[PDB]
């Protein structure tokens, strides 16, 4: 176990109590860096380790398609974590005021959480820091390499970044151990009912169509740590060797679809990327899924950690700034409302195309997903107008939403973050420019329109 994946974010006085991992961002029972260290070190105290797990009440901010793929998911993992003797705790509410009154209830002698650069994980943390008096460590089992490991600032370009993250693979790509069952079972409701009322509240919001039936549609991706596993080993027989050639095709379903097993971290990265490595196929075609699922991916997480503003405009590049702020008068071709762009009613089918995928499936194509929101860019009142309402549809409609990959995906498109200056445009600048003719000329733009009516 490599000390450099785990942190100290508080000191204090250990208790004689169970080692807490507060669970959030890797929701995993196999290959979990979190909780493997958290075993461990309950293990050199002569104590258990116990799982506790916060729904929070921001699962309103976002649908049912999000709180059902995430519940399902944890209903799945208490039977897993259970079979390991180690029991799964669900308190409903805050964690600053759950996590501190669940470490005092149960007299928690060390508090173990995972790693997210996001902005609302960095608040929960402060409120549980300022209410326990017990040792408090987090641990990057989201990354193969650690974030603050990898690069110890903010990588402009990933041609910076690569090298770095590939130099230091030898040493943190590695085979998991496996978790330890606790020695005997040791000393607040079902799940069951909170996905009751959690969806009973969210039905008002729902995506609906004119005729009252609903958009999304749940049969596309199984959730839970088994199918998860079942979706790596599909990419990696059948879809892995034509990944190289038709990961820009949306007509053509040859992705690996792991993202949003990858969000809530039902599968880690570092047991797909090993299955990756050792899998005979395409030279170019591991290449390419190495450097999305490797550097895009843990870039995302750079771009969070080592920027506080990630989601606003003054973290774009000074040449991006400059090229927009010069063309914030520019008389825009046309400009539509969030509820235009929500429902799909913009002038380009393409664009329309890509939202009805968003809304039906929760998961819209890579490719598609840069085209969707440059256009937002090219269709709004401002750059900082394009950035509220491509993270407000993103963070909605997407799966794998909410997501440091959805902020550092919308920055590269609308403020050109781990881009570079091309041709200067009107509105848009020197951002990099996407036109439909140009989606015609890579893809069969009509057959993807007419998939998604
Ligand atoms: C506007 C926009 C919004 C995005 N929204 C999200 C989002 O909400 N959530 C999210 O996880 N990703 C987002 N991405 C990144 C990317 O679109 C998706 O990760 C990808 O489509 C996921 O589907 P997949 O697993 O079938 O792709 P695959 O090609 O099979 O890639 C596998 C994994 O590599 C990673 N990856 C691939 N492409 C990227 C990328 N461009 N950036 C970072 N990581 C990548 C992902 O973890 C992905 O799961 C967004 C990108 C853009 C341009």
């Not at 470490?103 to 960095?122: C, E, H, M, Q, W």
């Not at 193969?144 to 990898?150: L, M, S």
Request: charged content about 30%.
């Amino acid at each position: 176990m490599n000390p450099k994946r785990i942190r100290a974010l508080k000191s204090g006085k250990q208790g004689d109590g169970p080692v807490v991992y507060w669970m959030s961002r890797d929701q995993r029972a196999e290959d979990n860096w979190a909780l493997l260290f958290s075993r461990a070190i309950a293990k050199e105290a002569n104590v258990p380790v116990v799982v506790v797990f916060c729904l929070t009440d921001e699962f309103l901010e976002a649908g049912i398609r999000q709180y059902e793929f995430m519940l399902k998911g944890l209903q799945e993992l208490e039977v897993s974590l259970s079979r390991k003797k180690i029991p799964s705790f669900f308190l409903r509410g805050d964690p600053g005021e759950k996590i501190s009154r669940f470490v005092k209830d149960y007299n928690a002698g060390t508090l173990v959480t995972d790693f997210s650069p996001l902005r609302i994980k960095n608040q929960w943390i402060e409120k549980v820091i300022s209410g326990i008096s017990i040792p408090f460590f987090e641990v990057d089992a989201h990354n193969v390499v650690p974030c603050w490991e990898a690069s110890q600032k903010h990588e402009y370009a990933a041609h910076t970044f690569r090298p770095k993250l590939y130099a230091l693979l030898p040493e943190f790509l590695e085979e998991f151990p496996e978790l330890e069952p606790n020695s005997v079972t040791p000393e607040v409701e079902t799940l069951s009912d909170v996905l009751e009322t959690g969806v009973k509240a969210l039905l008002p919001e729902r995506a609906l169509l004119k005729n009252k039936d609903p958009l999304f549609e749940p049969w596309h991706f199984e959730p839970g740590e088994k199918a998860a596993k079942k979706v790596m080993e599909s990419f990696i027989a059948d879809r892995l060797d034509s990944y190289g050639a038709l990961r820009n095709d949306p007509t053509k379903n040859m992705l690996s679809n792991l993202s949003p097993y990858l969000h809530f971290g039902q599968i880690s990265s570092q047991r797909v990327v090993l299955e990756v490595e050792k899998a005979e196929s395409n030279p170019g075609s591991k290449k390419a899924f190495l450097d999305e699922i490797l550097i895009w991916k843990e870039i995302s997480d750079n771009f969070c950690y080592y920027n506080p503003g990630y989601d606003g405009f003054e973290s774009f590049p000074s040449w991006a700034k400059e090229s927009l702020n010069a063309h914030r008068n520019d008389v825009r071709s046309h400009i539509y409302t969030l509820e235009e762009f929500e429902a799909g009613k913009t002038h380009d089918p393409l664009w329309n195309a890509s939202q009805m995928e968003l809304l039906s499936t929760g998961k819209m194509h890579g490719y598609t997903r840069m085209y969707w929101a440059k256009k937002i860019l090219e269709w709004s009142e401002s750059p900082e107008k394009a950035l509220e309402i491509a993270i407000c549809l993103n963070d909605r409609y997407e799966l794998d939403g909410r997501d440091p990959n959805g902020y550092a995906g919308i920055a590269w498109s609308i403020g050109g973050v781990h881009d570079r200056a091309w041709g200067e445009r009107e509105v848009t600048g020197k951002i990099r420019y996407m036109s439909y003719e140009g989606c015609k000329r890579k893809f069969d733009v009509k057959l993807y329109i007419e998939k998604y009516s």
